[PDB]
Amino acid sequence: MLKPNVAIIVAALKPALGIGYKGKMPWRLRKEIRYFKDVTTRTTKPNTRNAVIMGRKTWESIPQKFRPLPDRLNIILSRSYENEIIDDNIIHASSIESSLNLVSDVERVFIIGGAEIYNELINNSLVSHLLITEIEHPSPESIEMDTFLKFPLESWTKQPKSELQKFVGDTVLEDDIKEGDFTYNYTLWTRK
Numbered sequence: 001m002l003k004p005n006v007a008i009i010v011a012a013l014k015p016a017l018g019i020g021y022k023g024k025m026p027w028r029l030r031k032e033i034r035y036f037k038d039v040t041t042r043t044t045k046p047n048t049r050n051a052v053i054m055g056r057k058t059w060e061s062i063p064q065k066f067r068p069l070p071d072r073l074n075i076i077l078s079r080s081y082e083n084e085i086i087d088d089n090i091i092h093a094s095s096i097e098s099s100l101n102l103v104s105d106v107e108r109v110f111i112i113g114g115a116e117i118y119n120e121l122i123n124n125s126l127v128s129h130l131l132i133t134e135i136e137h138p139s140p141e142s143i144e145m146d147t148f149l150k151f152p153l154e155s156w157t158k159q160p161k162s163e164l165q166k167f168v169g170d171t172v173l174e175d176d177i178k179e180g181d182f183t184y185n186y187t188l189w190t191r192k
């Protein structure tokens, strides 16, 4: 696949954009997880699949029995990896672009984390869309976190919900989803 448009998908707590704590997510939002699954799995084309790219640490955080993520091509990046097709569902690579040369029959490509991956790859011009779940809590500074996005949001434009809906197609998009003390909304951003 030559120069595909790639999207980052992440859930972050406002206003600091915290995303993790000691290798884990700082919340368990059941509905958000199902949205993640639907968005990264759904395709429009016939014999296609989407690809999900992640850093080695994120991969290793999934219990062995639950990896690869089903129904998507999984790509794992490590600076130590050779560019290798493991099986039909798993690819090893040392760079995003290199990994994409190994794929065919992919519709969309999503970067799913983690922090190092996100913070590096946001500056790669292949990245054209950000799908950010914006989480809010009454006392954000009560939720322990050690990992944050460092995204140059002044160079991006948040689109109206209508553009998000068009991006996700079928997927039901509820507003102001509340779970425990957290309230969240899905957003789409594109480059200025």
Ligand SMILES: NC(=O)C1=CN([C@@H]2O[C@H](COP(=O)(O)OP(=O)(O)OC[C@H]3O[C@@H](n4cnc5c(N)ncnc54)[C@H](OP(=O)(O)O)[C@@H]3O)[C@@H](O)[C@H]2O)C=CC1
Residues within 6 Å of the ligand: 009, 010, 011, 012, 018, 019, 020, 021, 022, 023, 024, 025, 054, 055, 056, 057, 058, 059, 077, 078, 079, 080, 094, 095, 096, 112, 113, 114, 115, 116, 117, 118, 120, 147
């Ligand atoms: N809130 C959310 O939506 C999400 C949050 N997260 C959170 O992120 C945190 C984990 O992030 P982090 O620890 O940074 O791990 P990552 O998943 O980002 O993995 C980092 C590893 O990826 C490899 N890597 C990183 N950058 C590159 C690059 N540019 N090219 C090639 N290989 C690269 C390296 O592997 P090697 O060392 O082998 O070279 C590096 O050690 C956790 O707290 C997790 O919960 C994760 C996903 C979503």
Ligand SMILES: Nc1nc(N)c2c(Sc3ccccc3)cccc2n1
Residues within 6 Å of the ligand: 009, 010, 011, 032, 033, 036, 058, 061, 062, 111, 112, 113, 133
């Ligand atoms: N919006 C969004 N973005 C992601 N990247 C998510 C991920 S990615 C992940 C995959 C395996 C292990 C840890 C995180 C997991 C759960 C919910 C997620 N929500």
